[PDB]
Design a protein around this ligand. Structure first.
Ligand code: SF4
Ligand code: SF4
Ligand code: FES
Ligand SMILES: [S]
Ligand SMILES: [S]
Lengths: 629, 629
């Protein structure tokens, strides 16, 4: 087959139904695009930012510069920066909603509560906040403080970056002048820099991208993830079911899909009410069940158990169209990306009802708009159930043939920095010792999406992970790439048998898998806490550690903002497919060759799993040599 | 040559020097681009937002949707929304700096003062602020309030929109649900919506664009322009010199260029110090002179007189390269767009020194970086003078042959709402009366850039303005298009005789030109105060008034965000060249034909001055007919 589908049997089975039903889908839509691909855009050397365009760089025809005078390096880095404003904006949006949700929870107007009170008070103490009064008082103060971090300008010093970044990185960032403003001002400044005839200097634009990455992690991601832990618990390792075989067509099936978990949690709470299970049964269903999809799903499985109501995680974004083709979904409730914009016809064909639960998410054919507000989430969740009951009765049951693949996989979800320390007996030292001894050569942060650009869904990701663990490299994973490895079975104890000799031994002694599910791409900041702990304990800089990052099937700028962060944090950062920059030679030289002398990090490229793994291992072994281990 | 150059003889003369010197320039760089133009990008039906791209819509080869499933209408509107995040960000950036500058002025830390105290106290009264204490105390409170407007989230009601918008518009916006958040949250929400697999609904994306336009005018532009008036005075009509003949090579010549006028004002104040003049003469110059370029220059000519130090306005952004070829500039001090990124080689050839005065502005070959802070602007201005004296002595004097064109034109600058009321005897009603009587058919806000896309520099703008005034349509102008009309002589009393029978007679009796210079594209909000005053005087909605807007040589999203505002405000809004949307037929239908039933406004297109003017007049006459006049 000349059409890239998927490495996953479940998805290929459902692709077959979409094709038989003659429904458009991402896999098939790839092929027409291949007839007329623009190589200028592929290489980053086109521009559409003003009316003197559209421009292209082509020296042979005399088009060395854009009409305005910008060169290829400035052109490519500027559009990268602009797109990364979108990525930073999504993290900033999510963070603000988390903080408003914590505040309104403390004020009594949500179905949530303060669950991890120890984290709330420890964070408050680390931030030098007033901890007098009751937990609700402290939660309000924390929320307002973290909103201030979002809103801080160019000239007001941050506190989160001082608490959560390692010492030696701080001196690098001070020398380079890249301590960022809060993400709201930083993304506004970056967007303003990208307007025509403002910032046309590729070095400056790259520096602004590194600042944007730092602003996202310290100014949005770390606060939002810890606040979600305060609300919903800090994840600990537990068994979860994944893949599309978790569906049972005889139940009313509600799937929540996005990045923000608030609606999902509210749905689980509501579905556990006897009145709602009775509604489902009165409608002819066996009972009512909730399923998580993509990143919102992963947020929930990190912190919640499988039970009779919540059934597990469906898969990553390229599984959404196949998932509708099961003919088993009653409501798909969509809160952020990825909610692909041609789902309308598929929902109609397979008898599913689409519900947007964010003002961000709109596309043709959505039936219902229930935009999120914390004080309304209880009522939103109940309305979704009511919609699902009616949909089951009148759109799906007795009308739609279900086609649910048998594939279910088990994954150990819920690794957090706290889970790792517990597994090691309360200190990071045992991990340091197994690294020094060479049992584990190093560790990789796999922080990734999925795409079709460089292979069938998840092909590069899964095979690269297998090659890394064979080389005794431990993986901490987040994002759609984490869902892929979970579905592929790399996150359970059976996966120990795929690891090399040193990592297999450590995994068996600690009773952990060789791939540790750390959650979402929003958890890049949290993963940095583990790397920071290693750097602080060894008193070496992050750039000196035997680690690397890979986003090997990146799709959009949630992943690239995490890559820009990784570069600023000093790390070897592999990205595939190539970002649109390869036509800008001085920018390529900066990112791939010169950044080691600037931040310590560098971009690495390629889609061959074996070569990429060998290059990562070579970098790790170079770091090991310099450490004398 | 067949290269599109300019309608201005001065620019054409200096283009010849650039060409003879074989220096790259915008005019010549247009031609290579014309060889390889992408029609997908021209029509808005390409996409580069994720790794599954670059995508193109071409139904003839089966590429009906992007890989993700988005259609052509969603694709085109989404990229328009993303680019307009940049436009909004630049206005928000400027507003924030204006508010910090007012605050730091009130605290005594700048070379500025509170000039228009009446306006300060009137704003405080209208906004229900505390007016106790001294004017400086009130200025601090106003600054903090206007910063709050910048930061307001989507769920907190704004006050500027209540005070400064008319009753019926507020009702329409309420009914449509398009009351925006503050511009910081609104631009973050817009950017997040544009990430792949978030908002792919062209109608929703267009609605978000309308909201973004409203947020920009009420949340940034009106506040910033009124605060600039508080600091530097409210413009009143006065005679100004324009065009490139204002230079004299025997002086030390400092040009400020951008949109934010703070550095330019500080430079004028410093240049008036006798000590600095003495320094210039000791260096061999006759004295030290300051000149304004583009929008920063226009802000200053609106409010300041020509004198021995401040000499006037050079022209719009396509004049910057020609200006350097005069061989008369000692420092070009650049604060924002437009600062074209290949000026370095031109500055080197012609003996000028480039200084960036904003962290936004970077490009190859800049000599000095003096990022603006209010408390440092006195030191910044003095350092620029010191740089300029050294540059005159070492780079230019006796080394560079000047070639200053002879052309100088007179313009009456400084029209504001206050100036119109004064010219009418204190009330708007005499203008209403001559409009009702048919002497003036209606009024157009010409809010525009300049570009080469649809003609030689300023060709469409000037010829359209001539056709409009011939049809007895009064013009209120802002932007690079206003600079064009000043240089072309449409803004002096001689231009009365270019107007039609009714408008010429009215202008002769009132002693005003038929084109009233209202300043910058940042003054769209201020122009809306005049249109709002007309709506209130006639007791009708803005969509019912005999007015229109035109951006007839738009370049980037400072202009398009004003056009989006104008559509939301209910106006016929002509834009040329075509924005990149014409390949999206449903989006075109929405913007050009269905919006009148939604907001009342519509987009109009075309670059033929006679046809565009006839279409504007036909809309105005339709509005007149429905008003009974
Ligand atoms: S910003 Fe420069 S390179 Fe981009 S379209 Fe405009 S003229 Fe061309
Ligand atoms: S967002 Fe959609 S249309 Fe744009 S490049 Fe990605 S797949 Fe193609
Ligand atoms: S699709 Fe237009 S330049 Fe690439
Ligand atoms: S990601
Ligand atoms: S403009």
């Amino acid at each position: 087959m000349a059409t890239k589908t998927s490495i996953h049997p479940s998805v290929n089975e459902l692709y077959q139904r979409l094709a038989e039903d003659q429904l458009s889908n991402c896999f098939d839509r790839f092929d027409p695009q291949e007839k007329i691909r623009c190589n200028y855009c592929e290489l980053g050397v086109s521009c559409q930012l003003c009316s003197n365009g559209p421009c292209r760089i082509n020296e042979k025809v005399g088009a060395t510069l854009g009409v305005c005078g910008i060169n290829a390096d400035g052109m490519a880095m500027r559009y990268m920066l602009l797109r990364n404003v979108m990525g930073t904006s999504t993290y900033t949006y999510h963070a603000y909603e988390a903080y408003k949700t914590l505040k309104m929870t403390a004020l009594g107007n949500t179905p949530f509560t303060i669950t991890d009170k120890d984290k709330l008070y420890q964070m408050a103490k680390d931030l030098e906040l007033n901890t007098e009064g009751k937990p609700e008082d402290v939660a309000v103060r924390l929320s307002d403080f973290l909103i201030w971090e979002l809103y801080r300008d160019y000239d007001e010093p941050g506190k989160m970056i001082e608490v959560y970044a390692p010492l030696k990185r701080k001196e690098v960032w001070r020398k380079l002048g890249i301590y960022p403003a809060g993400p709201l001002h930083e993304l506004k400044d970056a967007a303003a820099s990208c307007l025509t005839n403002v910032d046309g200097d590729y070095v400056s634009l790259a520096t602004k991208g590194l600042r944007l990455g730092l602003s996202c992690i310290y100014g949005a991601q770390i606060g939002l993830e810890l606040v979600q832990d305060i609300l919903f618990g800090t994840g600990m390792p537990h068994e979860m079911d994944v893949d599309l075989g978790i569906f049972d067509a005889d139940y009313i099936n509600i799937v929540f899909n996005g990045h923000e978990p608030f609606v999902g949690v509210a749905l689980i709470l509501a579905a556990k009410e006897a009145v709602n299970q009775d509604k489902a049964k009165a409608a002819g269903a066996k009972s009512l069940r909730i399923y998580g999809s993509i990143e919102s799903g992963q947020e929930v499985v990190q912190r919640f158990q499988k039970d009779e109501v919540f059934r597990g995680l469906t898969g990553n974004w390229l599984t959404i169209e196949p998932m509708l083709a099961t003919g088993a979904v009653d409501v798909l409730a969509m809160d952020m990306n990825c909610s692909p914009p041609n789902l309308g016809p598929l929902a109609e064909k397979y008898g599913a009802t689409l519900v947007s639960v964010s003002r961000l998410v709109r596309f043709p054919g959505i039936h219902h708009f229930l935009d999120y507000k914390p004080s309304e989430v209880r009522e939103i969740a109940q309305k979704i159930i009511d919609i699902a009951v009616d949909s089951f009765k009148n759109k799906r049951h007795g009308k739609i043939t279900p086609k649910i693949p048998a594939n279910i996989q088990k994954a150990i979800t819920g690794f957090t920095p706290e889970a790792i320390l517990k597994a090691l007996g309360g200190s990071i030292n045992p991990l340091i010792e197994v690294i020094k001894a060479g049992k584990i050569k190093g560790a990789v942060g796999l922080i990734n999406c999925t795409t079709l650009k460089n292979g069938p869904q998840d092909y590069v990701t899964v095979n690269l992970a297998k090659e890394l663990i064979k080389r005794d490299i431990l993986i901490l994973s987040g994002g759609c790439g984490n869902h892929a490895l979970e579905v592929a079975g790399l996150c359970n104890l059976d996966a120990i048998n795929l690891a090399g000799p040193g990592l297999s031994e450590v995994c068996r002694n600690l009773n952990i898998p060789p791939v540790l599910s750390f959650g979402t791409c929003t958890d890049t900041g949290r993963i940095s806490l583990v790397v920071t702990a290693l750097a602080n304990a060894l008193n070496v800089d992050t750039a000196d550690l035997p680690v690397a990052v890979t986003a090997p099937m990146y799709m959009e700028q949630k992943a690239t903002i995490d890559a820009l962060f990784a570069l600023a944090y000093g790390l070897y950062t592999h990205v595939a497919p190539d970002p649109p920059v390869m036509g800008a030679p001085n920018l390529v030289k900066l990112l791939t060759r010169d950044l080691p002398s600037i931040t310590g990090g560098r971009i690495a490229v390629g889609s061959d799993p074996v070569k990429v793994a060998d290059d990562i291992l070579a970098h790790i072994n170079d770091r090991r040599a310099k450490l004398g281990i």
